[PDB]
Design a binder for this molecule. Structure first.
Ligand SMILES: C[C@@H]([C@H](N)C(=O)N[C@H](C(=O)O)[C@H]1O[C@@H](n2ccc(=O)[nH]c2=O)[C@H](O)[C@@H]1O)[C@H](O)c1ccc(O)cn1
Ligand SMILES: C[C@@H]([C@H](N)C(=O)N[C@H](C(=O)O)[C@H]1O[C@@H](n2ccc(=O)[nH]c2=O)[C@H](O)[C@@H]1O)[C@H](O)c1ccc(O)cn1
Lengths: 801, 801
C-alpha cells in the first residue's frame, strides 16, 4: 500500500516509511501516475527546449559516444553516435560561417556513415576486429598565403592547402596497418633525410629561429657547386634537395603548449583550432597531425619551402614518447636513410648538415654522429660567471673527451640535441632496447633500469656499437657547430644538471656491466676489439677517479694550502713565527667551514626544490668560490717561488697546460683564456652541489540488473585499490634504492678522507695524486692529438687505403 | 559543391578536400540525405534496442542530471531528471525483488515530483534560491531482528525500522536551515550527552569492542544507587539514561572503509547498500546518514539500547572535517549539555563516564576534561620493549605533567581520544578558531598556521581558557581510565609520533605567543592570573630546556662516561695505567659513532618514508640502546662507589627518584619497576629519531554557438593553469618554512655542543645541568603532590567553601 508521497520532492522535508512486504499491489501505481497533470507541463517544456539543438550538445554527445566505444559497449555507442550525427546535420544549416557550416556538414555525414557501418558490424554482415571510425583527413585552404613569395616550383594544391588528420593509434608500431598515410607518400615523394624537433612549453622566437636556421642549411645545400671532390652527389644535389627532406615537429601536449606558439603556428599555416575541435569530436584520437609545405620569409629574403609535419599529442608524456612516435610511426612508414634528432632552439650554422651528410656518405662505417655544441653569444655579457663557466666546460669537454672517444670509434653520449643516425643500424634491436621503458612497466624492470631515467641517449649509442652480426662505429664531427641557450643563474644550472648526472652515472654503470657483449656477440676486427679493451681500462680508471672526487679536492686543498700555512711549507713566506694560535686556527676554520657547508648543502638538496633556496645556494657557492680563488693564488705563488725542476715542470705541464696545448692545437684558445678564471671559481661548487643534488633527488620519475551494477561497483573499487597499492610499492622500492646509493657514496667519501688524513702525510700522499692526474691528462692529450691527426690526414690519405 | 563523400566513414581511409567558399549550395544536401537507406535500418535497430530500459542507464542519467544541476544549468537538468524518472518508473514493474520494486517506484515518483517543482520554478511560479531536490528520508525494516532480546521498553517502530537520508549540505552550519532532521528530534527526545566515534579504515573487532564498552558504561550508569551523596541526579538517573545519550559514528569515506566493517554494520542494522544506491541517485549528496536504536547481545547477556547515528561521507577528508560535521550540524541542532570525543578502539572502564559526569556536575567551573589513557595488556607480552617503553611513558607523562598542569587549571593538550567538553564554553569563538583551516584557504593563513597541522586539540584547549568575558578552566580526572592499542614495532611508533611532535611544537609556540590574551581579554580572578603567570614562566623554561635536548644528552654521556674513562674520573677503576692509545680511542670511537649515526638518521628521515627502512632504523636504535645501557651501568657504578654526601644524595633523589616517589604516592609503582629499564634503553632513540623525523617531514599536509564553446574551453584551461600555479606556490612556501626551521634547530644544537665542549670543562658544566634537571623535577613533583592533595581533600572540604 502506497503512503501519502504525492508531495515529497517539492516539499522541503518529508518523512516516509517504505515497507518491504510482497511488493506494491498492482492497479494502484497507475492511478497515482495518471492523477498528476504537472508531468504533462514538464514534458511540454522539455520538448519545447529540446526542439532546437546546439553545437556544444552535439560535441558532448559525440565525446560520450567515443568514451563508450573505448569501453567496448557498442549499442550505447551506436545510439550516441546517431544522436550526435543527426544533431550536427541539423545544426550545420543554422550556422552562418561558411567554413563552420561545411565542416559540420561533412562531420555529420561521416558520423552517419560510421553509424551505418557499425550497425552492419553488429548485425554480423562485416567481420572485423576492433572496428573504429574510418580514417578521414581533411585539407583546407590556409588563412594566410603570401602572394609575394618566389620559390622553385609549387603546385597550387601543395602551396595553398593544409591537411589534417586525427590518429587513434595506441601502439605507434601499428600506424601503417591502421591505414594512416602522410602527404609525402601520397604525392609520391620519398624523402631521404628526416629531422625531429621536440617541443614543450616554448616561445615562438625559439621555433622561428630553429626553422630559419634549417632553411639556411637547405639553401646552403642547394647552392653546392657541382663537379667537385668535396661536393655531395645524388639525393642531396642542388635545386631538388628540399623535396628529399622532411621536418617533424612533435609537441608534448595541448595543455602545456604556450598559446603564442599556437598563434605563430597558425600564422604559418600549421594549426587551426576550429578544424581540430570539429573533426576530432568522436574519434577520441591519441594525436592530431597537420601537414604542410611551409614557406618562410625573413626580411627581404625568401627562404626555401620546408615539408613540415606537426604532430600534437593530446595528453602529456616524456620526450621518449615523442621519439617513440617519431621513430616508430614515421620512420617505419617512410623508411628514410638518415635520421636527425634535435631540440627546439638549437640554432645551426650553414654547414652543419653538409658536414654531417659528408661524413656519413664518405665514411660509411658510421652508425651515428654528433656535432659540436656551443653557447650562443659567449663573449657578449662576459660579466656573467655562470655563462662563461659553461662555455669553458663545453669547449673543454668537446675537445678532450669527444676527440679521445672518437679515436676509438665509441662516443659515450650523443647529445640528443643535434645528433644523427642512419636508419639501418638502429631499425631492430637498438630501438627495441631504446624504448624498453615505454613497453614494459617499471615493476618488472626493477629499480636499476628505471633509475636510468633520461639516460636514453647513452643506451642507444651503446646498443648501436655492440649490435649482433654488425660492426657500427660512432663518429664526432668538429665542423658541425650548433649553438644552444644556457641558463643565466645558478639555480637554473642546478636544476638542469640533475638529469644529466643521474643518467650519466647509471648509463656508465650499465655500459661497464655489459661491455662484454662487444666481444661475445658483435662482429668487429681484432684490432677494434683490442682498442675497445684499452678504452675500457681507461674508462674504468676515469670513472673510479671521478667517484672519489669530493674527497680528493678536499684533501688537495687542505694539505697544500692549509698545512703549508700551518707546518711552514709555503715557499713565499715563513710561518716559523706567530703564536701557535693562528697556525691551528687556519685548519680549524677550514674544517668547520667545509663541514658546515656540506651539511647545509645535503640538507637543502635532499629537502626541497632548488627554486626557493636561491639565496642559500648563492651564499654557499660564493664561499666555495672565494676559497678556490684564494687556494689557486696561493698555489701559483708556491709554484713560482720554487726554483723549478724537471719533475716540477713536467708535472705542471701534464697537469694544467694540457688544456692550453690542446686548445691551441685545435685553434680554440682565446675562449680558454677568457673563461679559465670563471671556470676555476666554480669547481668546488660544480662537484659538491651538482653531485649531491643529483644523488639526493634520484627518486624523481614519471544491459544489467541491480546485482550486476553492485558487482561492477565492487570490481571498480577493488581494481582502484590494487592499482594504488602497486604504485605505492613501486615508489617505496625506488626511494629505497636511491637512499642506499646516496648513503654508500657519502660514507665511502667520508671514510676515505678520514683514513687518508689520519694515517697518511702530505709527503706520502701528494705524489700519488699528481701521478694519477698527470696520467689521466696525458691520455686525454694523446687522444686529442690522435683525433686531430686523423681529421687532417685521412682526407688526403684515403687514396692509399 | 559536395565531393564524393558518400562512403567516407565506412572505408578504412578516405581523403577529401572541403572548400571554404560561400557555403554549400542548397537543395543538394537534401538529395544526399534522402538517397541513403542504411540510416533507416540503423534507426530501426536503435529504436528496438532503446525500447527496453535498464537500471544502470537510469542511475547514470540521474547522476548526469545531478552533475548538470550542480553546474547551474537547469533545462538540461530538467530533461535528464524527467528521462531518469520515467526510466525508473518503467523499470520498477519488471524487477522481481519486492524491496527493489518498492524503492524504484518511490524514487521514480519523487523524481517526477521534483521535475514538476523545477518546471514551476523555471516558469517563475515559485520564487526560491538554489532549489534542490526535496529532503526525503526513508525508513525500512532491519534485515536481522533479535527475537530473543530483553530490553527496558522499545516501540515497534523504533525497534524494527532503520532510517536513512542523504544530505547535500555543503556548509555544515546550514544543516538545520535546509530542513534535515534527526529521529531523536522528531520523536521528542532531547539527549543531554553526545559521543562521537571517528572511524577510518578499521576492522570490525575494534568497533565491536568500543560499542560493548559504551554499553557497559550505560549499564553502570543505570544501576547507580539512589539517595547517595556520590550518585548523579537528574538527566543521568537510572532506567532512563539510555534515552539521554546519542552516539554519532562518523566515517571518513566509502572508498577506504574496510568491507568487513560495512558487513558488520549491516549485521547490526546500520547500513544497507541497495537503499544507498537507489535513494542517492540524483541528489548528489555530500553525506549519507543512517539512524537506528541498536540492540547488542554479547554471550548470554543482553546490553542496553544505544541511539546511534552513522554518518558516512562520500569523499575523504581529514578527521577535522568529521569533527566539523559532528559539532556544527548535530550540536547546533540538538543543543546538548556535554560533548564527548573519542576514537575507535578506545575501550573504556565501567566508571569512566560516571567520573567525567560527576566532575562536570559537581565542579561546574570546568570547560573541558580528559581521562587517563593506558596501554591495553601491558604486562602481557612483556618481552616486547617498545610496548613497555610506551607504557612507562604514558604513566609518567600522565602523572607528572597532567597533575602539574591540572593544579593550575590549564591542560596543554587534551588527548582527542576520550576527552569531553561542555557545549556552552565552546559554542562561539573557540569552535570558530577550531575550524579556521576548513573555512579559510591555507594561502591566506600562511605557513605558520598551516604547519600547525594535527595540533587542533591544543588550539581548542587554549581557546576555551582564554575566552573573552568567561572564566573556564580545564581539569584532569584520574579515575576515568581508557585503554588504547599501541604499535608493536619501532617503525609504527616512528610513523605515529611525527604528527604528535609537529603539532606539539607549533601549538606550544602559538600558546607562548598568545598567552597575553588571558590577562588582556579574559575575566579571571587575580589569583588565577598570578598562577597562570607562574605556569607561563615554568612553561618557557621547560620548552627552552626541551629544545636543546640532543646536545645535552650527548654532552652528559660524553663527559661522564668517556671523559671519566679517558681522564681517570671513574671511581670504581683507575685509568692511570694503559698505553695512552685506548684513552683517546674511547673518545674517538664515541664521537665517530655518534656523528655517523646522526648523519644516517637525518639522511633517511629527510629522504624516504620509514616503512622500507626498517632494518636501518632497527640497527641505529640498537646501537643507541646498547650505548645508553652501558652508560647507565657505568653511572650507577660511579654513584655507588662514591662514599656519598648530602649534596650527592639530594641531587640523586631530586633527579631520578622523583619518578618512584610520585608513582608510589599515586599507587602506580609496579608498572614503573617493570618498565624503567625498557624506557631507559630507548631514550636516545626517542629523542634523536623522533625529533629528526618530525622536523624533516614537516611538509606533509592535505544554448551556445561555436564561439561560446571556444571561449568556454579557453576559460577552463586558464582556470586549471592558475589553480596549478597556486598549488605549486603553496607547496614551495611550506617546504621553505620547514627547511628553515630544521636548519635553525640542527645548527643551534651543533653550535651549542661545540662551544660547550671546546671552551668549557666537565667540572664547570655538569653542576649547571644537575641544577637545571633538579629544579625541573622538583617543580613537577610539587605539582603532582598538590594535585593528589587536592583530589583527596577538596571532596571532604567543599563544605567549608
Ligand atoms: C638543455 C638542452 C636544451 N636547451 C633543452 O632544454 N632540451 C629539452 C630537453 O632535452 O629536455 C627539450 O626536450 C623537450 N622536452 C622537454 C621537457 C618535456 O617534458 N618534454 C619534452 O619534450 C623540449 O623540446 C625541450 O626543448 C641543450 O640544448 C643541451 C645542451 C647540451 C646537451 O648535451 C644537451 N642539450
Ligand atoms: C593514536 C590513537 C588511536 N590509536 C588512533 O589511531 N586515532 C586515530 C587518529 O587520531 O588519527 C583515529 O582518527 C581517525 N582518523 C584517522 C585517520 C584519518 O585519515 N581520518 C580519521 O578520521 C580514526 O578514527 C582513527 O582511529 C591513540 O588512541 C592515542 C593515544 C594517545 C593520544 O594522546 C591520542 N591517541
Amino acid at each position: 500500500p502506497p503512503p501519502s508521497i504525492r508531495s515529497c520532492g517539492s516539499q522541503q522535508y518529508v518523512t516516509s516509511y517504505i515497507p518491504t512486504g510482497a511488493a506494491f499491489p498492482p492497479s494502484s501505481v497507475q492511478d497515482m501516475i495518471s492523477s498528476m497533470k504537472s508531468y504533462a507541463s514538464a514534458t511540454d517544456l522539455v520538448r519545447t527546449y529540446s526542439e532546437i539543438p546546439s553545437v556544444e550538445e552535439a560535441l558532448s554527445t559525440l565525446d560520450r559516444a567515443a568514451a563508450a566505444l573505448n569501453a567496448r559497449r557498442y549499442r550505447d555507442a551506436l545510439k550516441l553516435y546517431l544522436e550526435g550525427g543527426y544533431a550536427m546535420a541539423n545544426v550545420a544549416e543554422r550556422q552562418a560561417n561558411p567554413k563552420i557550416c561545411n565542416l559540420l556538414t561533412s562531420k555529420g555525414f561521416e558520423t552517419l556513415n560510421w553509424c551505418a557501418r557499425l550497425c552492419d558490424w553488429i548485425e554480423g554482415r562485416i567481420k572485423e576486429k576492433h572496428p573504429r571510425p574510418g580514417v578521414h583527413k581533411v585539407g583546407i585552404p590556409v588563412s594566410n598565403w603570401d602572394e609575394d613569395w618566389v620559390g622553385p616550383f609549387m603546385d597550387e594544391e601543395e602551396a595553398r592547402r593544409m591537411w589534417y588528420t586525427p590518429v587513434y593509434c595506441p601502439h605507434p608500431i601499428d600506424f601503417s596497418n591502421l591505414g594512416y598515410r602522410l602527404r609525402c607518400v601520397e604525392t609520391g615523394r620519398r624523402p631521404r633525410l628526416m629531422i625531429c624537433i621536440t617541443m614543450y612549453n616554448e616561445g615562438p622566437q625559439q621555433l622561428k629561429a630553429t626553422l630559419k636556421k634549417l632553411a639556411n642549411n637547405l639553401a646552403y645545400l642547394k647552392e653546392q657547386m657541382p663537379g667537385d671532390e668535396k661536393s655531395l652527389t645524388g639525393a642531396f644535389a642542388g635545386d631538388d634537395v628540399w623535396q628529399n627532406v622532411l621536418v617533424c615537429i612533435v609537441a608534448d601536449g595541448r595543455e602545456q603548449v604556450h598559446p603564442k606558439t599556437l598563434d605563430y603556428l597558425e600564422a604559418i599555416g600549421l594549426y587551426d583550432e576550429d578544424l581540430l575541435t570539429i573533426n576530432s569530436a568522436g574519434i577520441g584520437a591519441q594525436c592530431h597531425l597537420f601537414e604542410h609545405t611551409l614557406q618562410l620569409s625573413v626580411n627581404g629574403k625568401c627562404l626555401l619551402p620546408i615539408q613540415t609535419v606537426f604532430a600534437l599529442k593530446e595528453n602529456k608524456a616524456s620526450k621518449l614518447d615523442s621519439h617513440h612516435w617519431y621513430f616508430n610511426a614515421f620512420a617505419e612508414q617512410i623508411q628514410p636513410e638518415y635520421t636527425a634528432v634535435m631540440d627546439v632552439g638549437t640554432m645551426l650554422t650553414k654547414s652543419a648538415l653538409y658536414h654531417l651528410l659528408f661524413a656519413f656518405e664518405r665514411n660509411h662505417q658510421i652508425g651515428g654522429a654528433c656535432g659540436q655544441l656551443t653557447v650562443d653569444n659567449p663573449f657578449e655579457n662576459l660579466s656573467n660567471w655562470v655563462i662563461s663557466a659553461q662555455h669553458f666546460e663545453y669547449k673543454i669537454s668537446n675537445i678532450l673527451d669527444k676527440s679521445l672517444e672518437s679515436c676509438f670509434g665509441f662516443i659515450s653520449v650523443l647529445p640528443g640535441a643535434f645528433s644523427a643516425y642512419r636508419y639501418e643500424a638502429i631499425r631492430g634491436a637498438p630501438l627495441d632496447a631504446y624504448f624498453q621503458t615505454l613497453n614494459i612497466e617499471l615493476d618488472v624492470l626493477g629499480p636499476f633500469i628505471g633509475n636510468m631515467y633520461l639516460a636514453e641517449d647513452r643506451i642507444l649509442s651503446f646498443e648501436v656499437v655492440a649490435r649482433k652480426n654488425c660492426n657500427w662505429t660512432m663518429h664526432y664531427v668538429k665542423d658541425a657547430v650548433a649553438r644552444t641557450d644556457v641558463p643565466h643563474d645558478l639555480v637554473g644550472l642546478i636544476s638542469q644538471r640533475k638529469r644529466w648526472l643521474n643518467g650519466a652515472f647509471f648509463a656508465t654503470l650499465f655500459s661497464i656491466w655489459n661491455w662484454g657483449r662487444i666481444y661475445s656477440e658483435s662482429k668487429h676486427t681484432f684490432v677494434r676489439k683490442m682498442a675497445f679493451l684499452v678504452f675500457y681500462v681507461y674508462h674504468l680508471l676515469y670513472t673510479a677517479f671521478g667517484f672519489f672526487l669530493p674527497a680528493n679536492l678536499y684533501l688537495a686543498l687542505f694539505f697544500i694550502v692549509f698545512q703549508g700555512f700551518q707546518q711552514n711549507r709555503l715557499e713565499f713566506i715563513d710561518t716559523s713565527e706567530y703564536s701557535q694560535t693562528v697556525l691551528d686556527c687556519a685548519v680549524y676554520i677550514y674544517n668547520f667551514s667545509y663541514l658546515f657547508g656540506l651539511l647545509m648543502l645535503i640538507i637543502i638538496g635532499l629537502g626541497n626544490n632548488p627554486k626557493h633556496m636561491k639565496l642559500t645556494y648563492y651564499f654557499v657557492g660564493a664561499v666555495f668560490g672565494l676559497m678556490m680563488m684564494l687556494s689557486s693564488l696561493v698555489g701559483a705563488g708556491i709554484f713560482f717561488s720554487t726554483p723549478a725542476t724537471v719533475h716540477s715542470i713536467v708535472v705542471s705541464i701534464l697537469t694544467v697546460g694540457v688544456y692550453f696545448i690542446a686548445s691551441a692545437l685545435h685553434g680554440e684558445v682565446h675562449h680558454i683564456f677568457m673563461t679559465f678564471t670563471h671556470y676555476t671559481a666554480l669547481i668546488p661548487s660544480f662537484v659538491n652541489i651538482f653531485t649531491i643534488y643529483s644523488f639526493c633527488n634520484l627518486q624523481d620519475l614519471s544491459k544489467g540488473d541491480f546485482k550486476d551494477v553492485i558487482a561492477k561497483r565492487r570490481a571498480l573499487e577493488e581494481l582502484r585499490r590494487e592499482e594504488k597499492e602497486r604504485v605505492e610499492n613501486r615508489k617505496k622500492n625506488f626511494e629505497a634504492f636511491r637512499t642506499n646509493v646516496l648513503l654508500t657514496w657519502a660514507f665511502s667519501n667520508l671514510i676515505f678522507a678520514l683514513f687518508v688524513v689520519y694515517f697518511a702525510s702530505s709527503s706520502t700522499y701528494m705524489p700519488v695524486l699528481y701521478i694519477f692526474v698527470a696520467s689521466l691528462n696525458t691520455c686525454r692529450l694523446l687522444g686529442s692529438i690522435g683525433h686531430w691527426v686523423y681529421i687532417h690526414t685521412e682526407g688526403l690519405r684515403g687514396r692509399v687505403i
